[PDB]
Amino acid sequence: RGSHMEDFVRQCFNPMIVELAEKAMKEYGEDPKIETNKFAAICTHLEVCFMYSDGGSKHRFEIIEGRDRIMAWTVVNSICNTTGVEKPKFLPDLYDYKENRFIEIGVTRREVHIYYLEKANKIKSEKTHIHIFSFTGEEMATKADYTLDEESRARIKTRLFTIRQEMASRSLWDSFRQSE
Ligand SMILES: O=C(NC[C@@H]1Cc2ccccc2O1)c1nc([C@@H]2CCCN2C(=O)CSc2ccccc2Cl)[nH]c(=O)c1O
Numbered sequence: 001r002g003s004h005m006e007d008f009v010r011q012c013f014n015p016m017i018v019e020l021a022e023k024a025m026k027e028y029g030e031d032p033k034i035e036t037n038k039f040a041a042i043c044t045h046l047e048v049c050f051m052y053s054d055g056g057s058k059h060r061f062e063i064i065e066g067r068d069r070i071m072a073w074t075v076v077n078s079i080c081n082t083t084g085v086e087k088p089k090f091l092p093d094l095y096d097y098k099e100n101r102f103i104e105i106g107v108t109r110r111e112v113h114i115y116y117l118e119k120a121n122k123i124k125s126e127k128t129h130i131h132i133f134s135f136t137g138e139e140m141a142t143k144a145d146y147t148l149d150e151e152s153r154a155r156i157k158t159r160l161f162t163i164r165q166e167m168a169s170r171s172l173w174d175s176f177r178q179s180e
C-alpha cells in the first residue's frame with residue numbers, strides 16, 4: 001500500500017533529508033511506509049536541526065541527529081572529553097561550541113508549555129539546553145536563551161507553517177495533528 005502522506009513527504013523535503021529519516025526509522029525498526037505521520041515528523045525535525053545548524057557561525061554547531069546511533073554517540077564522547085561536559089543520558093540533537101552545551105530540538109503540534117515539561121522530564125540532564133518550535137510560530141527555550149538570531153529562528157518558524165499549509169491543502173493536516 002502507498003499512502004498520500006508518504007508521497008507528500010518525499011516531494012516536500014529534499015532527498016538528503018528523506019533518506020536520513022528513512023535510515024533512522026529502519027535503524028529503530030519502524031517502517032516509513034506504514035507510520036507515515038512519524039515519517040513526516042522526522043523529516044520535519046531533521047530539517048529544523050539543519051536550519052538551526054545554519055544559524056550560527058561556520059564551525060559553531062555540531063550535528064548529532066541524523067547520524068547512525070553508534071556514530072552519534074561517538075561524537076558525543078569526543079565532545080564530552082574535549083569540553084569537560086557531562087555525558088548526557090539520552091542522545092541530544094546538536095552541540096553549541098560557542099555556549100558549550102548540548103541542545104535538544106523539539107517540534108510539536110501542541111502547546112509549547114506541555115512539550116517542554118515532558119521533554120525535561122525524560123531528559124533529567126540539567127545541562128542540555130532545550131529549544132522547542134511549533135507549527136503555529138511559538139517557541140520556548142530554557143532560561144529564555146534562544147541561542148540564535150531573531151532572523152534565524154524566524155526562518156525556521158515560517159518553514160514550519162509552510163509545511164502545515166501544504167499538508168492542509170492535501171487534507172493530511174488533521175490526521176497529522178491527531179497522530180502526536
Ligand atoms: O533523537 C530522538 N530519538 C532518538 C532516535 C531517533 C529515532 C528515529 C526513529 C525512531 C526512533 C528514534 O529514536 C528524538 N526523539 C523524539 C521523539 C520523543 C520520543 C521518542 N521520539 C520518537 O519517537 C522519534 S520520531 C520524532 C517525532 C517528532 C520529532 C522528532 C522525531 Cl525524531 N523527538 C526528538 O526531537 C528526538 O530528537
Ligand SMILES: [Mn+2]
Pocket residue numbers: 065091092093
Ligand atoms: Mn534527536
Ligand SMILES: [Mn+2]
Pocket residue numbers: 045093104105106
Ligand atoms: Mn529532538
